[PDB]
Structures are given as C-alpha cells and as structure tokens.
C-alpha cells in the first residue's frame, strides 16, 4: 500500500531502518464497538483485503465460540473450500506483486487472469467480487448456485499449468535467485521470539501450521 520508511545508510548498506505506519489507520476497533456483531462483520473484509473470507471465518469462529453453537457440516465444507480459494488468491497476489517489484511484471498479468476467474466465483456465490461478506457466524449466508461446483472443477483442473508457467520464469532463473537467495535470513529462535507466524516461521524450518 502506502509506507513511510526512514533509514540511515552508510554507502549502499542499510545501517538502520524505521517504518512509520498509521497512514491507513481508520480506527476500526473503536468503530466496531458502536455496531452489532452482524454490523461489525463487514469490517473484517476490509482488514486484510487480499484474503477476505479468511477474516470472515476467523470472526465467525470467535463469535460462535462465545455463543456456544456450531455451523452445520455443509457450511463448514463451503467455508474451507472458499478459504482455500482465497488462499490461492492471496498467494497469487504475493508472488506476482513481489515479482513486479523486482521487475518481472509478466506473471502479474498471467496470474491476474486466474484471479479474475476466482473473482467471478466470488461474485457468483455472493454478488460481490471481493468484499463478499458471505461467511457469517451461523454459517454461509445464501448456499451455492447450481452450476458453481462444475465451474470450480473446470477452473481448478488447469491451474497447475498456470503455476507451472510461472515456475519456469522464476524458479530456475539466475536473476531471481540472485535477488532472493540469502536475503532476509531469520533464525528460528528469532522468528519465534519476534512473534512471526505463517510462512515466516515455516521458511526457517519450524514445523507449525494451525
């Protein structure tokens, strides 16, 4: 997004780095207190706006736990399926934008086509392309359309090729490796103490997955 970075540099090397945040702080947590739970649900779509249904799922899980209820099995299956689709969206986002910042910029388009297809899936299930607000504490809001599963299967049976095409460009490239190898190394103890989670842990060898 938008980031302010103040650094002290001695020559080319970076001696000190200090990021200033708050340019995107809208005070959401205080706004939530004035809304009911259903009214506070759409904020989590905006929180991490690359992985929306995942935040929806987290909020829904928290609320039901306090309530002492549980969704029906089909709701859980739809939740997990769309969470995996959202993970595909977010990983495409991260890899392609990282390559664009490095300077590749072609896989950005190649994979944003698939991102548009997944946005069509989102819109078909909920009517909104990204800010879906589909997952609720009780369960999924409206149920799947009749032809959705077949289209998901059709999309998902050619995506490996897309990843494979992307792989050819960056996995074996020497410029990409020289740009990424031995950069930003963090030890397992430092990653655990500094509060890291997700890939930032698993890249250092820590076997942890929620």
């Amino acid at each position: 997004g938008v980031l302010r970075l103040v650094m002290e540099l001695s020559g080319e090397m970076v001696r000190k780095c200090d990021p200033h945040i708050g340019l995107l702080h809208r005070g959401t947590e205080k706004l939530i207190e004035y809304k009911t739970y259903l009214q506070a649900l759409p904020y989590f779509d905006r929180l991490d706006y690359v992985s929306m249904m995942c935040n929806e799922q987290a909020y829904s899980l928290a609320v039901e736990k306090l309530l002492n209820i549980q969704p029906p099995p089909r709701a859980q299956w739809i939740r997990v399926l769309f969470g995996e689709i959202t993970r595909l969206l977010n990983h495409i986002m991260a890899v392609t934008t990282h390559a664009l910042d490095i300077g590749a910029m072609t896989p950005f388009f190649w994979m944003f086509e698939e991102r548009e297809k997944m946005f069509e899936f989102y819109e078909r299930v909920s009517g909104a392309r990204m800010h879906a607000a589909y997952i609720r504490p009780g369960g999924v809001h409206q149920d799947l359309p009749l032809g959705l599963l077949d289209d998901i299967y059709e999309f998902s049976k050619n995506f490996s090729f897309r990843i494979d095409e992307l792989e050819e460009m960056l996995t074996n490239n020497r410029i990409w490796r020289n740009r990424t190898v031995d950069i930003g190394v963090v030890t397992a103890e430092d990653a655990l103490n500094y509060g890291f989670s997700g890939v930032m842990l698993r890249g250092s060898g820590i076997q942890w997955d929620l």
Binding site: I21, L24, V50, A94, H98, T180
Partner: peptide, 16 residues
Amino acid sequence: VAIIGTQDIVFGEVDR
C-alpha cells in the same frame, strides 16, 4: 524491497 515483498504486508491489517 525484496524483504518487504517476502513479508507479505498489507497495510489495512497492519494499521486497522
């Protein structure tokens, strides 16, 4: 830039 990209940072969740 590479480190920021590999951290997978979106400022909507950072700032809230």
